[PDB]
Symmetry: D2
Subunit: 288 residues, 4 copies
Amino acid sequence: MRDLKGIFSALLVSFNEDGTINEKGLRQIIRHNIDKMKVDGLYVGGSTGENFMLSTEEKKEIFRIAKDEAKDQIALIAQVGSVNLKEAVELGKYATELGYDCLSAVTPFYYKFSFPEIKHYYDTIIAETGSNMIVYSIPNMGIEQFGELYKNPKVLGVKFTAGDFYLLERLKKAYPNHLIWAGFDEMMLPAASLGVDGAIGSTFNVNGVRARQIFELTKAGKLKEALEIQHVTNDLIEGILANGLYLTIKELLKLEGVDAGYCREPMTSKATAEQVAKAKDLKAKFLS
Amino acid sequence: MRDLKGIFSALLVSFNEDGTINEKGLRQIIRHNIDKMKVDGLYVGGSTGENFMLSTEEKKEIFRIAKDEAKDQIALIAQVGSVNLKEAVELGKYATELGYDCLSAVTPFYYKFSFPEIKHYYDTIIAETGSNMIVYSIPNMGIEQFGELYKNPKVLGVKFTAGDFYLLERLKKAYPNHLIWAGFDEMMLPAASLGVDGAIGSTFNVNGVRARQIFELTKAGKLKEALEIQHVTNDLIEGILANGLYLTIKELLKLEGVDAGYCREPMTSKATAEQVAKAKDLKAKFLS
Amino acid sequence: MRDLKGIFSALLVSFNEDGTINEKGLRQIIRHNIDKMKVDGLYVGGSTGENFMLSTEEKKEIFRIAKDEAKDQIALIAQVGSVNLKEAVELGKYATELGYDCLSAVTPFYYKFSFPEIKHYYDTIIAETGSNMIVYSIPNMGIEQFGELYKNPKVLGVKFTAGDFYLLERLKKAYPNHLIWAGFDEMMLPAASLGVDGAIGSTFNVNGVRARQIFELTKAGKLKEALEIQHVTNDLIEGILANGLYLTIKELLKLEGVDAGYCREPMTSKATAEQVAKAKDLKAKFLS
Amino acid sequence: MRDLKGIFSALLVSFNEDGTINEKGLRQIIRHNIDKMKVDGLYVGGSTGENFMLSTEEKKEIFRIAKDEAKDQIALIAQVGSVNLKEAVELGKYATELGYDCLSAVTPFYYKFSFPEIKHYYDTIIAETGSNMIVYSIPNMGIEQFGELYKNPKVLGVKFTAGDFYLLERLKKAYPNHLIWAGFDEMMLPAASLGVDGAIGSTFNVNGVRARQIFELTKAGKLKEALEIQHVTNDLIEGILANGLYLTIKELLKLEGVDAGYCREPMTSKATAEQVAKAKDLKAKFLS
Ligand SMILES: CC(=O)N[C@@H]([C@@H](O)[C@H](O)[C@H](O)CO)[C@@H](O)C[C@@H](O)C(=O)O
Ligand SMILES: CC(=O)N[C@@H]([C@@H](O)[C@H](O)[C@H](O)CO)[C@@H](O)C[C@@H](O)C(=O)O
Ligand SMILES: CC(=O)N[C@@H]([C@@H](O)[C@H](O)[C@H](O)CO)[C@@H](O)C[C@@H](O)C(=O)O
Ligand SMILES: CC(=O)N[C@@H]([C@@H](O)[C@H](O)[C@H](O)CO)[C@@H](O)C[C@@H](O)C(=O)O
């Protein structure tokens, strides 16, 4: 398959006021990422796409729209994990039939599942689809557990989201050919200093230019320039996080002419006047 | 409004080896709770029912089967919570149409929702279905937030799950006409000492006789008697938790002639010979 | 030798403005507890005593004063734990030589000690003094471990401080002859419903009368009455907590005529005008 | 003014079997660090020196010995924090009188202090001693709280111990002239990539040559090479942690001819045969 290293925006989805998918808006978000953010790929169906608040058919529709819009221009990873393994299988087959390059799957949540159940979960998704897989968990999983998961050759690596840099170094050390995508945009530099292979992030939807610079500069050992860019990026992320992550990134998109729509409920769907004013301010100070 | 105080078993569901619902087996679990455990009602669709691993259609099927088998012999509570509000509303409406007495919904999880989002979530389920509601959250939410939720008159009260007895006392003190259902079977006695109105539990599917005793004796001031029965119950409960909660209760049901079937994947579906043997010893010592 | 069951106030200490011990003030606190609060005993040098911010010599003067003031009128428990085992041994020996009825010692903190190191710590303080010992830890320690500590016959039981009501029933059940003192004043009722033998608490310095009531009514099966007294008590305790525990209890003692002094720095030593006014309102509402 | 940047070993202390300080041994640990590890300085009285298990007189003796042994060959920081603010003041004055370059102090612990209290503790220690200060806390306190601490111009910066690399970047961006010393030896590389000014660590007592290489190689933008040294360091560090941190580093020193003696009880004072064997193996693998 296609190279999966580098910069992947975790695709946001545009919703209408009633919560249905705004396909036109979604296509516009995709074009912005490919054409203007210059990403190496998209991670579709992740937490950033408001995946877990949608139906199975809704997830399928975004997968179809995203593939139809990006075609073969960029690499595409489909996040298909769920507490429902049958639905994870159904989505992984559908993504696979569409041509996604790889699957990703959150470890099953809500219940406290044991390691063997988690490993069976990933092995089943793999077996039923025939696709390669990128694992990840929500608030960890240690070196011994990664070794067991990595006994399946179709597990390519991990979307690392917890801020434990000793565990990140140990994983690269113990499983050096397995890939690591950093999931924390605001800690890209230190992640890249430990050799991650790429990054999957929500802020790359509007700050992809600087994210690629931090990455590439840090890999070149150009730390002082990389750090200046990480500092500006972090002022941007700090405002986005204080203002409302999802709504603020969609408002920033709308200021570039992307109809990024509303958020899906149970999330607050419409930005307040003050959230809107703050997004304009962030745009002015950092994306102008 | 049918009386909702008392002992409610959180209904377990029987699954075939392929993970599909075993309707015969589910009807036998329901008959055992009504006729042998003699519970006041069933809490259908909860975490004990393996609910969050299933599709919307399988959730509806379980609600169909449970209402058909129980008719109006006992009170029925439908748990319809989800990260997907549209699905919660759709499930709330179907359960309301089937004739469930009340609805229950877990606070939306996975994402970190704010309090207003959480209240908007419960207010929407109620307004779209017109039914009463029992709130609850997984791993708190304080007196001020419960008061806000209680501004909606259809919010009857809470299924209390975190072992914070100071908060339990405060909530009963502050809102004396709202109801509380203890969710921790092994802490029934102390909860009943602070005035809870009932209990919703997984172990009542096999230990409903003793659960009622502890509750009734504690409410009456017969503390010595209640505590001896809570001790024996906690010995059983300690063995069920060490042996595997879900499979053990199903193995205990099969020793009573109920086809409780398999667990649903991602959960470990089949009990090991060691787990079957331990269920047989627990049956012999505690439920014979 | 002497009975250790019942109500123990965790002795508060009076300090002057410069942080030195106000002996006259302390003796008055002791007098209020024995004569008005009618406690079965005092737990001296506990965290309520501002113990961990003082020197070894200051800890010794508090143990000399309390024993000289209380004489043989009430049971006395000396808390002598520390991160410094040589200090713990020194205090234990002194308290033993002053005539305290029993010792108590927090598990060594700061560092993460292993179970065996913790058992060796209690065993050493016992070996060096020959006194009975009441264990406790700050924020758990399970049944197995309590059984290991209880192999030493001088370990009488535990001052239970963590809100785990399931562990509390398991402990009492596994070791029916070992004693349990509830450390949480606001959860006295549910603790007494599971058979605890007494309580050690800071609010007994001002609410001693209602505390015995709750306890004695609850061991008597008069749960409706106990619950009411626990409700009023918890209104007082909530107000104490919100206003600042240590200074609020000292302001309340000052309202009875006890020179309870200032708090020792690094805690804020002096109450503000609002704290004093709130103490007065709590005097009027609950202790007049 | 003595430059405080760079590599600081957190000095280990040699104890006799009875727990008293082994002066000869301690001076051999000091000489090894100056002469063999080539550290820029020592951080004396830290948790690595087993400080919190000792008496105030013992702490003072350690300060006297380290300063008499190191003279002015290196920088010296004295950690004098305590839950006892008068003890903190007393220790700070003594260290200042001995010529220590700077003081450092843990946030007071055991109790839950407010921020105002914590700032008052630091201001008092400073005001009473006349010395500069390096703050630190145990397991976070944000940007806004470090700004308030830094209103006191004698607070030089922080010994950063929590693995939050976002906060670390934020701190350096908000107070670019204040210093940061990384406290996690296993994450030196990522910390140096964000511009920390130095590092304080326990493993530099045996791994000082590599620690300096990582630090200096990372500042030079030689990330590939720094990473390889961080990788072997971390295999050593992983083995030290698994085998018992303090005892393994002391056992490692003993194989270098340093009488590092025993640990101080409540910590296990003597290494077992297995711990001795594992230190010899770690010595052969990484430090020969
Ligand atoms: C929890 C979360 O939102 N994580 C983001 C980060 O990009 C995050 O948004 C960003 O670092 C701000 O904290 C991505 O890792 C999530 C991405 O992996 C996804 O599944 O959508
Ligand atoms: C997480 C969990 O298992 N909770 C159980 C308890 O009955 C629990 O099984 C029992 O106390 C054993 O710990 C119920 O509260 C869950 C019940 O409310 C449900 O929603 O299914
Ligand atoms: C941490 C704490 O303050 N606990 C108090 C409680 O009485 C407490 O003050 C009360 O329950 C209010 O929360 C006592 O248990 C402490 C007491 O055992 C002591 O050692 O002084
Ligand atoms: C908690 C702890 O042991 N921290 C060490 C680290 O060097 C640690 O030993 C090392 O990173 C291994 O985890 C030092 O930061 C402690 C040092 O700051 C001290 O105060 O002695």
